[PDB]
Symmetry: C3
Subunit: 300 residues, 3 copies
Amino acid sequence: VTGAAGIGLATLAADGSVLDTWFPAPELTESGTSATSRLAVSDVPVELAALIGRDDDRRTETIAVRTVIGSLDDVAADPYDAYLRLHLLSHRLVAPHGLNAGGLFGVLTNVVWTNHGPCAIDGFEAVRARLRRRGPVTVYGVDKFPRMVDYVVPTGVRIADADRVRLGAHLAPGTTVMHEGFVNYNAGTLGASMVEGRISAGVVVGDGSDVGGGASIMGTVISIGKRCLLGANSGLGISLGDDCVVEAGLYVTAGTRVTMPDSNSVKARELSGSSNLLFRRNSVSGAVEVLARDGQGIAL
Amino acid sequence: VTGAAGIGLATLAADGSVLDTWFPAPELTESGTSATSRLAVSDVPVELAALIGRDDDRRTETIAVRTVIGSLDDVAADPYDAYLRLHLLSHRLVAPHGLNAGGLFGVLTNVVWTNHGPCAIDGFEAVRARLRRRGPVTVYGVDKFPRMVDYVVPTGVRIADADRVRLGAHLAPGTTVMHEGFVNYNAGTLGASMVEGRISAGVVVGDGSDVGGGASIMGTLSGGGTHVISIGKRCLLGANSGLGISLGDDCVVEAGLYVTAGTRVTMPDSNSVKARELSGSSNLLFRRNSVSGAVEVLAR
Amino acid sequence: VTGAAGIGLATLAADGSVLDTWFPAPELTESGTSATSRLAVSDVPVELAALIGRDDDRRTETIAVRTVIGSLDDVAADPYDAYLRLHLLSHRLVAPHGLNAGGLFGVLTNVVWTNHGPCAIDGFEAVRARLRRRGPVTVYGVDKFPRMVDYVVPTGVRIADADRVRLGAHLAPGTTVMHEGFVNYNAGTLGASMVEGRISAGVVVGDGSDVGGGASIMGTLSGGGTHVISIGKRCLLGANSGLGISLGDDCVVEAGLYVTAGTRVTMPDSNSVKARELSGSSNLLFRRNSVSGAVEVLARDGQGIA
Ligand SMILES: [Mg+2]
Ligand SMILES: [Mg+2]
Ligand SMILES: [Mg+2]
Ligand SMILES: [Mg+2]
Ligand code: NA
Ligand code: NA
């Protein structure tokens, strides 16, 4: 049983709700006891001490806390713990599915993410009018999950449009997310990958696999092995092992009947996790087909 | 016989062109006489008084006005009128097609939307170099329509990436627009919907209907153009699917399938018909036979 | 035998590496000798003189340079040369392929683009904490290519979501990029186009051609990927379609259809050919028969194919 801990800079709403927490240096620890406590003065790091304060226009406060998770298998029991979990994944300290990422939607506050920092939904229109005295008020989004890069930039990674990567995404070194790529929380790449399509929550893509432009990986839990290629505008509703290809523009769902080299057919889920597969739609017959790659024959 | 009115904060370009207008509290009124006037000092609300001024770098001014629309049936006469219209839609005071939204392209100014506020295209490169003395100059878009959330955040809504929702989008409570979702002006949801695909101008989606990742509603080459389409209640569009006809309630389009008005679909009886002949019907499942390649429709 | 030159405002990282360079007024010149120099005080334009400095929080410096390319056929020599090239394209002084755009990835620095300006990856987490004393730190992206519009807004153009157009995109007058549109460097439009899908590096779209929402031009598995494709004039790609061969003029690809170079297509004579064999032809309509599921190509003008 592994725990985790982190000193964080939390922003709270006027009613005390946790809007976010930024943890500069999260870490894994021995299993222990779940709790968030307000840091005493002498325990606030100097770089965070200058950041603590109250924003009278937003009606928020920023405070320095320490959050401990006694066990990463427990569900998050509050926003601080949820944020810590998401930082652990994004710092690559834990791989997707290495901690319990359940219930986070239920636990996290819906936030107005602005060029002035996090704001509550409550009284936002009045807050917008106050903040406008400072200059333009830009809302980047309204949601429970903020932009990963606004908490951590992981190394060895490119992200062409960082609006498309949620905090809690795990991007292994050599990974590039292009504009059309999207990576959800508790999801991402284990190695080097070109990501130009959508990686759903819980989806993991193995080393050297690429997701083509506008490809869709369904939540379902689905994963892709190593060296797979999803063609642009393709779709995947089953897991793939290694060395699989889904053709450009083909949506393969779990219930899609696929014809095999022996002319027999099976639902695609019967092939889930298999290697060396190439999925295509025949351009003469319209039929979804599966071919064996590299003289490897097909395993159900 | 329904009009509208609003006190707004307008930004004018160096030549007088209306770049935008922010109306904190638009309202429906009895039918009246269309006009925009400058507020006298004593009529500018207090929260707005502090936001009036002139920006010498941008060569703009910000002014307090009152815009009255005599009849929501009339076409927008000027950009203030047009802005007031789009705010009514996004405030949900009016539903899509609840007011005349024609002709906005011709009325609206093309604007450079920046982290320093709206700017004219004319002389923009000189303006950029002046603003750079304040800090980085970031252009969010160049277009006639700005980002909804920069005017109003409607309640009961999530928007993962607020670049994707034009001012004028109507998003009923319970609606979530995900990253791949997009909602144009005079379009949106009437109830609780998960939007992860594209809602074109004029398109309305009924309560309970979900739009899968990357779905296209009424996109290019979906059909002969004339009438806008709409989705009813409890519909489901699969990821990367497409729709060029109206659906009633309880319809499904399978993932990956584009049903255009001119797509020939085969019915349970073996008889085929063009999809437009089914436009607006309920309880329909559209799918592509993974075996014969044919587009079929089934009852659900 | 054409060169180019420009006065630029360059931002350097703490270790001296070039993060970016903004050239307000690039220009084409006779062929010459490539070099970037630091401008002398008297040669700094008044507008840029105000913008030179050192940021202690980011540990960067902004300096005024002059960059010259001796020949546009030469590969970029360094990042200043690289940014000059991308400016010439986005200023429409050079159309795509009008200059050597090879090798940029290798020459360009990977940059954290923030609401406080370009930053190095190195020491970024300490930079963030420092910058947060000024207010929120927003990272727009971590990439070797920044956003076009943050260098030049070309006239006659609309761009609904400017995160989706890389510096180096060429967008001719009358072009609109919608939210789902995307334009890469050394790529874009030659005339008036509605762009609601994705234009890859090196892809050129002819006057009056429209790219439907979600359309994929030259995307992953669209073709053996050795040569770039282009679209001629008055072509139309349906929403959610894909294209992996070049089209001539007056071609249409139906909504939702992916035409790859290796797709077999049935012609009107009932013969069939790989789509690559039609590459560059005019007056074609590609569709998948909704009854038979076969990919088919028709002539669009009453006048055949073969
Ligand atoms: Mg590796
Ligand atoms: Mg997209
Ligand atoms: Mg953005
Ligand atoms: Mg011709
Ligand atoms: Na964006
Ligand atoms: Na033209």
